[PDB]
């Protein structure tokens, strides 16, 4: 099952709502996992499950979607969350990844 | 979840049906019973834990996942009976004494029934028998299944499907043979149609070489799922241990009621005494002698009768069901 | 108190199926492993269905491959038995000596030499006049009932009767077993893998028990285990001489 | 808590064969799934491969199968990795990563990571 | 004397008498 | 029609008799007779494990256990 | 037998013992997936036949 990120790229300000989409090929019913990749270090799980917040992460994050189209909703943008989004499936052995998305300070 | 190979199906055979029972515990002593089914209870279409749904294995070529709720599952042995919890494969009832124990799903007019043969026997704690526990009687320890949902009894070891093969990505016409695939799955082919081929293919594509359509095998590798080591199913090649889950219900040791029964009359008489014994139910009446020879006896007494039992110098001791152990000693009372 | 040591533990097992595997026109042999009653066997053709009727190419020549082994049940954790021999046993008072108007709470060892001691007092116990034993040389611990059964030694397993599922250990590896399950070539075409097997040994040993030496034992006496003792035992006169300050 | 630290020769020459080392401190090896991850610059991350700590089973990626192998060392709290015939589409940013969770292909831990280029 | 007791094979022969 | 098939008999060898130690967790029907002038013919159904002695004689005796194949032994002569 | 037209429902009842039976020399609760293939009389499915 193959991955098309979206959008690449996109540049906001502080306080701002993006809105980023994963696309899969093929029906992986609510199985995804989004990580936020912070640059010269590792990067750190978001949500799980595809709506679930992991413990830690900020509510203000929320994630949506079945089947083949899913959403994550960043809501009131903050500075130290420009990161590069990844969302990950784990149905299929291996797992695979994005081409990744780029979000920069206005 | 898998699909198995049910010994007893709705009507009369054999089936493949997808909530076969593997094996059915009875080691709780308050009749319930540990079932192992081949569907997943608890859990939704992506896997996570949520307690009104649960899953199973679909009929079609697509061979998907399908999902129904508890207001539609049964469990019944003779009659009906109380579903008390679950998780994943393991179920927990408690059932009336029968022959076999049977699952079924009720999904509107497609309703489908397993039956595999177990003795479940009405057993009972203590030495008394009972149909339901008195309000009043001793407290003994006991060993249930517990109600928590959160327990560990032990792991079972699940590893990688093998081929799961089918008749309908097959098709012959005018003396070929065809592979249909689904859209966006790759199915894999293995086949001798004279010399040995082996490739993965996602469109309509032919082959050559053979005629007759049962000669070849096509499977998707869908790694999406983990089986259970299970009897009714071809392995992968590579058979090695993956992964473990909990067995939940564990066998805990709690504190339960048995009944304390009605506390004999002792008629004295020289070197003997007379029990005078009523019990309504058959309860286990052992005595033995104090002496250098145990002399011992025991016999389950229904009814009202009496037992002439001889005492010595040395003395008798009797326990009449769960009482407290009574001790009896002769006189010299010679006449 | 005698002195106890444990051989292994019996209780219900649990007959594992592995999944047959098909390479259904080349060749398989026997292999061998250290698993608990491992027996495998190698048949000819079946050609087996599992759902769509098509699940072997090749038809002949369709060798398969069959295993069986077994492990211990899940709610084997606390229903089961262990296996125990007693040697010659050691009887422990416990005496209340009351000298005068000073009482005094001492136990002591029974053997003739050794003393107990309470703040001013010497006594010694010791031998017991009749030397006598409620415990045969095989005994069984099954959730506190002890068993007066002759059980078989290590490694000397017999199918149908207690003791044919050992191991030292609950969690131990080490598992060994012949408990005689036999392989028998399949004949229903879809796939299924037969097996014959004896009674489990362990439940003919729960039907045949017969009454607890807790109920049996005379002498006015009662059995206690972890570890195993024999409380409040009536017989033969002790010894006794105190060494009043 | 689980902590993971990467240790491997920075500089390789390639068709030689790759061995990277990651420790585990603070919890046993053989009760969690233990994994390898790769994330090539000015690229995305990928797969390579995961054991089981007391069972040994091995799941790798199916275009480096043949050139991924998976041991490890109860010993030395220890996992590795071997790569061999590297080329240099190889040069990646490798990350091993443990879970909270005893199987999960997400993992709640992971090391810093160590670089490792493949130039002659 | 045979130390086998049972086999499964039958007699092909017949002892004669006083022979 | 199918029919079940039980655990194969375990045969414990003795001067001019047999003994087969067997199980069965349902009542099953052993029928032998024996393959001289008098067949003596016994049959019982058997619940459980129970061990059975039987007498053979030089011209034979045929078991049959469960619904298997009628198996034929012989006796010897090891005095 | 028992017809349940809603609330009236009628019901009729003859007596007869109603046994289990089985075939071979074994006695059995369901079909095993495996055993001996035996010749024995059932009562056929199909409608169209006659007795
Ligand atoms: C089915 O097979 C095709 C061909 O191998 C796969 O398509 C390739 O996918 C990989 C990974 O996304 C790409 O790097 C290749 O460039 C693709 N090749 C072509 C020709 O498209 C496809 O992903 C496979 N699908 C499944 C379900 O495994
Ligand atoms: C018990 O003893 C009495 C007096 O000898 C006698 O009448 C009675 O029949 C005896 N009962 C039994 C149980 O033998
Ligand atoms: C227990 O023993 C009784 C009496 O021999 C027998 O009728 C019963 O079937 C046995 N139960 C089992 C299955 O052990
Ligand atoms: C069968 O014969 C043996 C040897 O004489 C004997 O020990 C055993 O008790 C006998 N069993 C029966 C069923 O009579």
């Known amino acids: 099952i193959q991955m098309t990120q979206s959008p690449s790229s996109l540049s906001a300000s502080v306080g701002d709502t993006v809105t980023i989409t994963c696309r899969a090929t093929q029906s992986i019913s609510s199985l995804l996992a989004w990580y936020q990749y912070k640059p010269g270090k590792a990067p750190k799980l978001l949500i799980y499950q595809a709506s679930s917040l992991h413990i830690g992460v900020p509510s203000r994050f929320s994630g949506s979607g079945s089947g083949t189209d899913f959403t994550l909703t960043i809501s009131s943008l903050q500075s130290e969350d420009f990161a590069t989004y990844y969302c990950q499936q784990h149905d299929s052995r291996p797992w695979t990844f994005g081409q990744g998305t780029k979000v920069d300070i206005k | 979840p898998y699909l198995g190979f049910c010994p007893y199906c709705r009507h009369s055979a054999p089936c493949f049906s997808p909530i076969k029972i593997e094996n059915v515990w009875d080691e709780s002593d308050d009749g319930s019973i540990r079932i192992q089914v081949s569907a997943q209870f608890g859990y939704n279409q992506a896997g996570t834990a949520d307690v009104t749904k649960f899953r199973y294995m679909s009929f079609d070529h697509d061979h998907d996942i399908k999902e129904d709720s508890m207001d539609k599952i049964a469990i019944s042995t003779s009659g009906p009976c109380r579903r008390l919890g679950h998780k994943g494969y393991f179920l927990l009832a408690q059932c009336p004494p029968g022959d076999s124990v049977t699952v079924s799903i009720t999904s509107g007019a497609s309703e489908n029934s397993c039956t595999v043969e177990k003795k479940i026997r009405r057993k009972f704690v203590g030495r008394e028998e009972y149909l339901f526990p008195p309000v009043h009687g001793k407290l003994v320890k006991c060993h249930v299944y517990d109600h928590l949902k959160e327990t560990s009894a032990g792991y079972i070891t699940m590893h990688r499907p093998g081929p799961h093969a089918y008749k309908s990505y097959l098709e012959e016409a005018s003396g070929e043979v065809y592979i249909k695939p689904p859209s966006g799955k790759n199915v894999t082919y293995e086949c001798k149609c004279g010399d040995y081929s082996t490739g993965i293919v996602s469109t309509r594509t032919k082959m050559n070489g053979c005629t007759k359509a049962k000669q070849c095998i096509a499977y998707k590798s869908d790694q999406t799922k983990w089986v259970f080591n299970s009897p009714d199913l071809i392995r992968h090649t590579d058979h090695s241990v993956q992964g473990k889950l909990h067995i939940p219900f564990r066998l805990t040791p709690t504190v339960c009621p048995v009944p304390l029964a009605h506390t004999p009359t002792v008629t004295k008489w020289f070197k003997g005494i007379t029990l005078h014994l009523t019990a309504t139910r058959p309860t286990l009446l052992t005595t033995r002698k104090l002496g250098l020879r145990a002399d011992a006896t025991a016999e389950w007494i229904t009814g009202t009768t009496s037992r002439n039992f001889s005492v010595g110098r040395e003395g008798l001791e009797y326990v009449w069901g769960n009482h407290e152990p009574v001790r009896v000693w002769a006189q010299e009372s010679a006449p | 108190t005698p002195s106890t040591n444990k051989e292994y533990v019996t209780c219900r097992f649990h007959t594992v199926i592995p999944s047959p595997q098909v390479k259904c026109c080349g060749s398989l042999e026997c292999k061998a492993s250290s698993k608990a009653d491992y027996t495998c066997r190698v048949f000819g053709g079946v050609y087996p269905f599992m759902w769509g009727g098509a699940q072997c190419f090749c038809d002949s020549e369709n060798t398969q491959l069959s295993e069986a082994y077994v492990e211990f049940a899940p709610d084997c954790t606390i229903d089961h038995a262990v296996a125990l021999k007693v040697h010659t046993a050691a009887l422990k008072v416990g005496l209340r000596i009351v000298y005068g108007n000073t009482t005094a709470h001492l136990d002591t060892f029974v053997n003739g030499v050794t003393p107990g001691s309470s703040r001013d007092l010497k006594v010694i116990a010791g031998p017991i006049s009749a030397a006598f034993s409620p415990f045969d040389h095989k005994v069984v611990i099954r959730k506190g009932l002890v068993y007066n059964y002759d059980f078989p030694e290590y490694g000397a397993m017999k199918p149908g009767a207690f003791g044919d599922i050992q191991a030292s250990s609950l969690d131990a590896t080490d598992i060994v077993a012949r408990t005689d399950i036999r392989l028998l070539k399949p004949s229903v075409k879809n796939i299924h893998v037969p097996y014959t097997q004896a009674v489990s040994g362990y439940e003919m040993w729960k039907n045949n028990s017969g009454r607890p030496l807790q109920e049996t034992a005379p002498f006015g006496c009662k059995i206690e285990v972890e570890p195993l003792r024999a409380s409040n035992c009536a017989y033969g006169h002790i010894p006794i001489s105190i060494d009043i300050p | 808590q689980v902590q993971l630290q990467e240790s491997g020769p920075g500089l390789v020459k390639p068709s030689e064969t790759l061995s990277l080392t990651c420790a585990v401190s603070?919890?046993?090896?053989?009760?969690?799934?233990w994994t390898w991850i790769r994330h090539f610059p000015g690229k995305g991350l990928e797969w390579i491969g995961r054991?089981?700590?007391?069972?040994?089973?091995?799941d790798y990626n199916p275009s480096l199968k043949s050139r991924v192998t998976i041991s490890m060392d109860l010993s030395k709290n220890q996992f590795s990795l071997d790569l061999t015939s590297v080329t240099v589409a190889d040069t990646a940013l490798y990350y091993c990563?443990?879970?909270?969770?005893?199987?999960?292909?997400?993992?709640?831990?992971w090391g810093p990571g160590v670089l490792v280029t493949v130039s002659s | 004397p045979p130390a086998d007791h049972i086999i499964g094979e039958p007699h092909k022969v017949d002892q004669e008498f006083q022979a | 029609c199918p029919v079940p098939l039980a655990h194969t008999p375990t045969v414990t060898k003795w001067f001019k008799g047999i003994t087969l130690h067997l199980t069965a967790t349902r009542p099953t029907l052993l029928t032998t007779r024996k393959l001289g002038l008098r067949a003596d013919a016994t049959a019982e159904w058997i619940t459980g494990t129970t061990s059975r002695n039987f007498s053979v004689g030089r011209e034979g005796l045929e078991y049959v256990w469960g619904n298997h194949e009628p198996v034929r032994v012989w006796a010897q002569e090891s005095a | 037998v028992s017809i349940t037209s809603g609330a009236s429902e009628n019901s009729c009842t003859v007596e007869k013992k109603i046994r289990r039976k089985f075939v071979g020399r074994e006695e059995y609760l369901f079909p095993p997936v495996h055993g001996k293939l035996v010749k024995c009389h059932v009562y056929d499915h199909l409608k169209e036949t006659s007795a």
């Open positions: 603070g919890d046993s090896i053989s009760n969690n799934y």
């Open positions: 054991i089981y700590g007391d069972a040994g089973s091995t």
């Open positions: 990563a443990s879970r909270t969770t005893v199987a999960d292909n997400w993992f709640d831990v």
